[PDB]
Amino acid sequence: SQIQFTRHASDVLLNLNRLRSRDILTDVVIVVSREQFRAHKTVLMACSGLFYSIFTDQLKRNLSVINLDPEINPEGFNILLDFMYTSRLNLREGNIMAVMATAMYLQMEHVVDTCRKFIKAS
């Protein structure tokens, strides 16, 4: 019987992306080959099976640095990070295979399936 604010969740994510752009309360750096990305652990846990599994582990929950597999493409990672914080996925012919492989590794099924839909359309 509660009142539903349909734009609230979208506004919260917007605000979390603004804090990320200002490096406010970021608590991890993700290292992908020669590139570094700062983020909020909670948002990464909320959007990725890989990060959920890492940071739920009491052994790894306080890490300040995560080194991803050196095979991961930093641009594919960056696209996925931006998607976690915006709900927008920048999929194109030139990036679809890297994005799909990165989303498999991060354990992000809806993106992987969208990549399979993009492949069906091209």
C-beta separation of 111 from 48 below 8 A = no
Helix axes 49-56, 96-106, angle to 10 degrees: 30
C-beta separation of 106 from 112 below 8 A = no
The option from ligand 7SZ, a copy of itself, none interacting with 112 (CB < 5 to 8 A, set by class) reads ligand 7SZ
Q: Which of 1, 2, 4, 5 binds ligand 7SZ (CB under 6 A)?
A: 5
Q: Which of 8, 34, 88, 120 binds ligand 7SZ (CB under 6 A)?
A: 8
Tokens 């999929």 belong to 91
Residues in 30-89 at the binding interface with ligand 7SZ, rule: CB under 6 A? 45-49, 52
25 is an interface residue for ligand 7SZ by CB under 6 A: no
d(CA 101, CA 74): 12
Q: Report the residue number, 71 or 87, with the smaller CB distance to a copy of itself.
A: 87
For a copy of itself (CB under 8 A), the number of binding residues is: 37
Reduce the DSSP state of residue 46 to 3 states and report it: helix
Q: Which of 29, 45, 101, 104 binds a copy of itself (CB under 8 A)?
A: 45
